[PDB]
Amino acid sequence: ATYAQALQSVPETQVSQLDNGLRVASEQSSQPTCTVGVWIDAGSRYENEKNNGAGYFVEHLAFKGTKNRPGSALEKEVESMGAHLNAYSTREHTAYYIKALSKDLPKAVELLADIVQNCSLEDSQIEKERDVILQELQENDSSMRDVVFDYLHATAFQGTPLAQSVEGPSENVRKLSRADLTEYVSQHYKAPRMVLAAAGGVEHRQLLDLAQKHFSSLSGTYVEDAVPAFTPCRFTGSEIRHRDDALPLAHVAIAVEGPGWANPDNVPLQVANAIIGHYDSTYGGGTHMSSTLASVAATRKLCQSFQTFNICYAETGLLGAHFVCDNMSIDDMMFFLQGQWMRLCTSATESEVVRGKNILRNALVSHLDGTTPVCEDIGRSLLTYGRRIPLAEWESRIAEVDASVVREVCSKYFYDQCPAVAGLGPIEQLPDYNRIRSGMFWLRF
Amino acid sequence: CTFLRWASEPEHDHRKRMGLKMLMMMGLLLPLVYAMKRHKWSVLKSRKLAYRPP
Question: Distance between CA atoms of A202 and A207, rounded to whole angstroms?
């Protein structure tokens, strides 16, 4: 059984749609466990300045209490069958998923319905929840990686809702109210933007019939008429520098405006990104890794944690790298990393493009291992794309991209485009924005 | 007297002609080069610093 035949097997993602709008989508293969969760489409993108941070607060208070399950009794149930309930809230999507045995599927969907529909939002829990977020804000302040990406979003998508952080400024969290959260739930937790998902020992008929008799109460209308629309964002190539010499290392992130979810250019660009690859000081590959920038970094002990990213929102995304090096390496690294991009924009070789395709294939396949990543893929794909992309289609797109395609797409997205650099800590060798934009084009070309 | 002035300064014509061109193109180079400077120096002129001590 070669690769292609295994890809064909690929149990399907049967998708349905009950009347109110909620679309169920399951993937049953053999496993006795399951990962059932909903994927409400909400986040910092659908949030104005006045209520920026409401979504994080709602996700905080979701598991605290419900009208049906009074208080921590919900936790008592969830731990009774050993389920691991969890929730994550990105800038675009906010999801709740339960990891539990398949036999306990009927109870899990009922628990999800209670959390996502009949949430108390009780005031005292709001007061107690307020302290947790504020402390969480300081913890994320110490999260020397996260603050850099927040700086990236703030300095790239200025003015637009995308610049807003997920947690929210530490002034809205100190002025929020039950009123503000209830509008967030009413205006965002609606059936059309809700993807019930499951993976494992979950019959699709089971998920459908459970959804009809638990989630049909979800409405599709929007209060009087107010429908939160989509506000397209603009990529303002800029620079933010939070110079703080006390910090040992100097996180730096540089990205340009990459494509949206629907744009097929994700497939080539990712390959190009896989060309640059990732490295950590504890890798062990050393000066033998095929990625040129990794080999240079390991040879000269330049960075510690450089890695590329492809953060991609609905209409626009960030495409670039984030490297963590000492104070007297940044000036060098901005030379090499940029020097790599231009190479991909001018002299990409099919020899390395094959390696990039293999790395992308392995990343896609390995990421889709285990029920929870499968459920995450289903919930995210039904929203971003509108359908779960089968691995066979991914294989076809990866087969299409070659050296010419990678060169063309990199030239179309990387070459001569203003970056969105964002520093932190003892960044002083970090070349001025004029220098960074200077590196964005090669005088040989 | 005109002849003697020409004898002293034979280039009197061409010099002036050359000057004319220098007037025109340096009336063109000077703004654009200035336009280049403000172009490449605007990053420093719109810095908008901020101080956030603990």
Answer: 7
Burial of A212 (0-12, 13-18, 19+ CB in 10 A): middle
The three-state secondary structure class of B36 is helix
Q: Is A303 helix (H, G, I), strand (E, B) or coil?
A: strand
* Structural method: cryo-EM
Catalytic one of A59, A77, A257, A352: A59
Q: Please give the DSSP secondary-structure letter assigned to residue A312.
A: B
Element (H, E) at A424: strand A422-425
Spatial separation of the C-alpha atoms in residues A157 and A161, rounded to whole Å: 8
Would you say A130 and A210 are in contact if contact means Cβ atoms under 8 Å apart?
A: no
Residues A154-164 as b or e (16 or more Cβ within 10 Å = b): bbbbbebbbbb
Interacting residues of B16 by C-beta distance below 8 A, sequence separation 6+: none
Strand order in the sheet with A23-28: A23-28, A195-200, A33-38, A94-101, A84-89
Q: CB contact, 8 Å: B45 with chain A?
A: no
Number of inter-chain CB pairs under 8 A, A vs B: 4
A59 belongs to the catalytic site: yes
